[PDB]
């Protein structure tokens, strides 16, 4: 079952990538977000990533395609597993922690409309022991 609220949440995730609001995610829009986070996929790789979600093969992801993928992922994952996978996405180097500076960068770029003050309070709350890193334990409490 997919609630109205859940669909709206998935639309917010879709719209993060669909920055021109034209109802499709292109390779260019995917590349813009990935480059902003420090990755540099080739155009071929971006095309292959789009193709993992682009069910009708027209070269872009629309919201029915996005929703199919996101709803299936949610049904297939548990609250504990999805937080660990997300941590590993953001712990790109797999070091066991995300530095405060790295987390600030992720939050400003993915939050889009967050002020530096809001990101400040988020980082301060997340970094429980104040050592300038968010480890897995602190990430789980932040995300729970």
């Amino acid at each position: 079952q997919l609630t109205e609220e859940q669909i709206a949440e998935f639309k917010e995730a879709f719209s993060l990538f669909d920055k021109d609001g034209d109802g499709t995610i292109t390779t260019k829009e995917l590349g813009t977000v990935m480059r902003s986070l420090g990755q540099n996929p080739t155009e071929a790789e971006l095309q292959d990533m789009i193709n993992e979600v682009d069910a009708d093969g027209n070269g872009t992801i629309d919201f029915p395609e996005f929703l199919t993928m996101m709803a299936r992922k949610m049904k297939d994952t548990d609250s504990e597993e999805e937080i660990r996978e997300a941590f590993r996405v953001f712990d790109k180097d797999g070091i066991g922690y995300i530095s405060a500076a790295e987390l600030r960068h992720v939050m400003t770029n993915l939050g889009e409309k967050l002020t530096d003050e809001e990101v400040d309070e988020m980082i301060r709350e997340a970094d429980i022991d104040g050592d300038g890193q968010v480890n897995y334990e602190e990430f789980v409490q932040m995300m729970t």
Partner: peptide
Amino acid sequence: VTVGKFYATFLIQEYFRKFKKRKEQ
């Protein structure tokens, strides 16, 4: 990798939502 990156974005956005809702209270 692809699905996980999209789902990770959703999960951090959910964290943003809950943070804002508590700040507004």
